[PDB]
């Protein structure tokens, strides 16, 4: 593969590592200086909302001015944002840093996707999209996994490290990358509904679980950030390995909808098994299981989008990202309030959203069969 594609993927990965970095520290960050869970959810919610607000303007600008320049400016703004987070002391500066980071992410991503689409012919508009999906999921999962680790010594430099990484990505991207309307009306959007709700569900569940897990496990079992780090890393590695080495094996013996429904049932049962667990090692093991459950759904949704879109893969790839941002924004914001009203409420809402997804899968499948 051309290294330019590698760096374009690395930019995505860095953005989604930034979106996931805050979770390890989340309790100790604002339950040492006197905040509540509402704002803990609101921080990451603000990040994702900034991403959403800003993606259209950033896309349009980038189209009218250039992709490499937009990408470089984005990376610079992301590095500045992330360095600003590591020096703040009150809530307003952290909110501004998260909003800035959202801005940088939402005006980075359109440039990266445009360049990838411009460098991949019609025979590689599916494999590269799958690679994008995989890198996004890996970065989101591994954000906390590395953010927990170095947090144990010199607490306030997982954003220093992220800033440094960001400037490295900047300089590598500028040096190496050698790059010097009515369409909706036709669309019936009567088949796109259920894949959109499925990706919304999946993003909601994953983001809400990641937000609630650290707070719950630090409150009950008093997890140090090392423990959250190791749990998330092990979970993600097990899920990715099970994915890569058994997916093809399960496709031969089911359909996409049934596979998604059984994976969702597996997720909902492992969540209650996590609820009942009250030991350090137990709750450590359940992480692997829960991430194995959550890693199956996303490729199925991407294949569903690819098989339904047909020729216009860009439309599906845009809707997927837009509603992934929707879920990433709406999940943690609700999760913080739920963790404020009670302790076990976020898992109850995760149960609810998973069963919702099961029901929509069931109804969709029933009416396609009929």
């Amino acid at each position: 593969m051309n290294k330019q594609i590698f760096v374009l993927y690395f930019n995505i990965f860095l953005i989604f590592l930034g979106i996931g970095l805050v979770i390890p520290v989340l309790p100790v960050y604002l339950k040492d200086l006197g905040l509540t869970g509402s704002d803990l959810g609101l921080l990451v919610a603000a990040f994702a909302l900034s991403q959403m607000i800003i993606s259209p303007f950033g896309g349009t600008l980038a189209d009218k001015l250039g992709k490499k320049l937009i990408i470089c400016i984005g990376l610079i703004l992301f590095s500045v944002s992330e360095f600003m987070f590591a020096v703040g002391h009150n809530f307003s500066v952290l909110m501004l840093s998260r909003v800035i980071g959202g801005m940088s992410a939402g005006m980075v991503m359109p440039g990266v996707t445009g360049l990838i689409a411009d460098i991949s012919p019609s025979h590689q508009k599916a494999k590269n999209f799958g690679y994008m999906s995989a890198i996004i999921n890996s970065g989101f999962i591994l954000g906390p996994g590395i953010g927990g680790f170095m947090a144990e010594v010199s607490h306030r430099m997982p954003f220093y490290f992220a800033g440094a990484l960001g400037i490295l990505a900047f300089i590598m991207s500028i040096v190496l990358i050698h790059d010097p309307p009515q369409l909706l009306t036709k669309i019936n959007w009567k088949v796109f509904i259920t894949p959109v709700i499925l990706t919304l569900v999946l993003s909601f569940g994953l983001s809400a679980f990641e937000t609630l897990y650290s707070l719950y496990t630090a409150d009950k079992v008093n997890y140090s950030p090392k423990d959250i780090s190791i749990a998330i890393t092990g979970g993600g590695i097990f899920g990715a390995l099970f994915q890569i080495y058994f997916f093809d094996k399960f496709m031969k013996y089911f359909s996409e909808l049934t596979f998604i429904a059984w994976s969702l049932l597996y997720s909902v049962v492992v969540l209650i098994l996590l609820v009942f667990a009250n030991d350090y090692w137990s709750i450590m093991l359940i992480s692997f299981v829960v991430f194995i459950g959550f890693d199956m759904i996303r490729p199925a949704i991407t294949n569903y989008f690819s098989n339904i879109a047909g020729e216009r893969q860009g439309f599906a790839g845009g809707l997927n990202s837009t509603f992934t941002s929707m879920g990433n924004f709406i999940g943690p914001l609700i999760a913080g309030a739920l963790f404020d009203v009670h302790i076990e409420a976020p898992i109850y809402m995760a149960i609810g959203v998973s069963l919702a997804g099961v029901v929509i899968v069931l109804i969709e499948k029933q009416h396609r069969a009929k």
């Binding site: 349009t60 980038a62 189209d63 996707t113 689409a117 216009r312 860009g314 439309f315 809707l319």
Partner: peptide, 15 residues
């Protein structure tokens, strides 16, 4: 001309 344009939230390929 082979070149992509940006509609809201997605790129689309010129004809």
């Amino acid at each position: 001309s082979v070149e992509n344009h940006w509609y809201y939230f997605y790129w689309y390929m010129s004809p």
